[PDB]
């Protein structure tokens, strides 16, 4: 599971 | 490049982080879901977060934000500038403690990067009956190899040296007993020698220690 | 003379 980031 | 792990999966990453790491630990690795991309895996709040790293061919980014010439520039940027990395609508993610890519053992029987041809020459020239070493597999990255000198002490025999693949996926030889460490597998096969298909017993009599 | 890379041997 990938986490979206800034 | 301490924090880069070439031959691991997302599940392996989680295992290292949860075993050897503390909160704030991280590493980078190749992407499995998108070959050619990279992945940042970070430990926070007892769990592991994976973050996609775009590799365009011209630059690296996190599918947004600042762009970098190399993977190491990216990683170093986010280590050096606390607050530049955050979950979308989430907390800042801190890259605090690099999780170093370490050898699977410190024993001097482990030669790391060493080819089959190189292992054959070392064992042939500097080994004798039952001399052994363990090295990385070049054809199966992430796996290892037991290379063992067989038969009498002469230089010529077929090669004087047998190579046995050690799967890492926990370590086995050819689907037998699974070991938690390379050292444990080697201990086991010192005491219970494996036997080649064609009938030679591979006794592990003494290590051929690295001089590296 | 060609020399191939060493092969892996099956055991047990």
């Amino acid at each position: 599971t990938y986490t979206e980031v800034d | 490049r301490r924090w880069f792990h070439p031959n691991i999966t997302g599940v392996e990453a989680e295992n290292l982080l949860l075993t050897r790491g503390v909160d704030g630990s991280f590493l980078a690795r190749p992407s499995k879901s998108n070959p050619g991309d990279f992945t940042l895996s970070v430990r926070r709040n007892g769990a592991v977060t994976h973050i996609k790293i775009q590799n365009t061919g011209d630059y690296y980014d996190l599918y947004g934000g600042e762009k970098f010439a190399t993977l190491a520039e990216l990683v170093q940027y986010y280590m050096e500038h606390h607050g530049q990395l955050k979950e979308k609508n989430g907390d800042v993610i801190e890259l605090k403690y690099p999780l170093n890519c370490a050898d699977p053992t410190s024993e001097r029987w482990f030669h790391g990067h060493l080819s089959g041809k190189e292992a054959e020459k070392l064992l042939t020239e500097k080994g004798k009956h039952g001399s052994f070493l363990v090295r990385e597999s070049q054809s199966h990255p992430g796996d290892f190899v037991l290379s063992v000198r067989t038969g009498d002490d002469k230089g010529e025999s077929k090669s004087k040296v047998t190579h046995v693949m050690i799967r890492c996926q926990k370590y086995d030889v050819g689907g037998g007993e699974r070991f938690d460490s390379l050292t444990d597998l080697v201990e086991h096969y010192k005491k219970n020698p494996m036997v080649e298909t064609l009938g030679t017993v591979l006794q592990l009599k003494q290590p051929l220690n690295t001089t590296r």
Side-chain angles (χ1 to χ4, degrees), chain B residues 18-31 33-57:
Chain B
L18 292 169
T19 67
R20 281 169 54 200
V22 294
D23 280 5
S25 288
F26 73 97
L27 59 84
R29 52 179 182 81
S31 166
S33 71
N34 217 36
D37 271 0
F38 293 92
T39 304
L40 178 57
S41 298
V42 196
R43 182 175 165 159
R44 41 169 195 156
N45 306 317
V48 174
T49 292
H50 300 284
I51 296 151
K52 283 166 70 75
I53 305 175
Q54 192 185 193
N55 174 12
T56 68

Side-chain angles (χ1 to χ4, degrees), chain B residues 135 145 162-163 165 173 194-197:
Chain B
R135 66 186 177 78
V145 178
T162 293
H163 310 262
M165 193 66 52
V173 167
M194 64 194 78
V195 176
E196 292 182 20
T197 305

Side-chain angles (χ1 to χ4, degrees), chain B residues 7-31 33-87 89-107 109-116 118-153 155 159-166 168 171-176 179-189 192-210:
Chain B
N7 292 119
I8 69 170
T9 54
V11 300
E12 285 155 327
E14 290 161 6
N15 188 49
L16 295 167
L17 286 161
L18 292 169
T19 67
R20 281 169 54 200
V22 294
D23 280 5
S25 288
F26 73 97
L27 59 84
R29 52 179 182 81
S31 166
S33 71
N34 217 36
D37 271 0
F38 293 92
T39 304
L40 178 57
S41 298
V42 196
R43 182 175 165 159
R44 41 169 195 156
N45 306 317
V48 174
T49 292
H50 300 284
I51 296 151
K52 283 166 70 75
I53 305 175
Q54 192 185 193
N55 174 12
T56 68
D58 287 291
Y59 61 86
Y60 301 80
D61 75 5
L62 304 178
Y63 284 106
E66 293 303 297
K67 293 180 169 76
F68 301 95
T70 66
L71 186 63
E73 280 160 73
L74 181 155
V75 172
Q76 195 59 40
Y77 178 78
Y78 285 116
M79 296 170 65
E80 292 179 359
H81 298 95
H82 188 210
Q84 287 294 289
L85 185 60
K86 67 183 294 232
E87 172 160 18
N89 195 48
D91 307 333
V92 165
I93 298 164
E94 194 168 10
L95 304 190
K96 193 176 172 174
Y97 299 118
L99 195 152
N100 297 348
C101 182
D103 286 340
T105 174
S106 36
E107 296 300 335
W109 52 251
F110 178 71
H111 285 237
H113 181 83
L114 186 71
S115 81
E118 288 172 335
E120 169 176 23
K121 184 183 158 68
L122 278 174
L123 287 160
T124 301
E125 295 175 10
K126 307 313 201 319
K128 62 176 180 179
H129 169 84
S131 287
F132 73 96
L133 62 78
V134 183
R135 66 186 177 78
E136 290 157 2
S137 175
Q138 297 190 6
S139 61
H140 298 269
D143 283 358
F144 301 89
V145 178
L146 177 72
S147 302
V148 186
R149 198 189 210 273
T150 61
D152 62 31
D153 274 11
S159 178
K160 292 298 298 185
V161 175
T162 293
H163 310 262
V164 189
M165 193 66 52
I166 301 170
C168 180
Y171 307 85
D172 70 284
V173 167
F179 296 81
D180 282 322
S181 91
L182 257 190
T183 296
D184 288 318
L185 177 152
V186 170
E187 290 305 306
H188 184 260
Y189 286 113
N192 300 285
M194 64 194 78
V195 176
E196 292 182 20
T197 305
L198 291 190
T200 306
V201 181
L202 305 181
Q203 288 173 278
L204 309 182
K205 297 259 48 183
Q206 58 284 321
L208 181 55
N209 286 139
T210 198

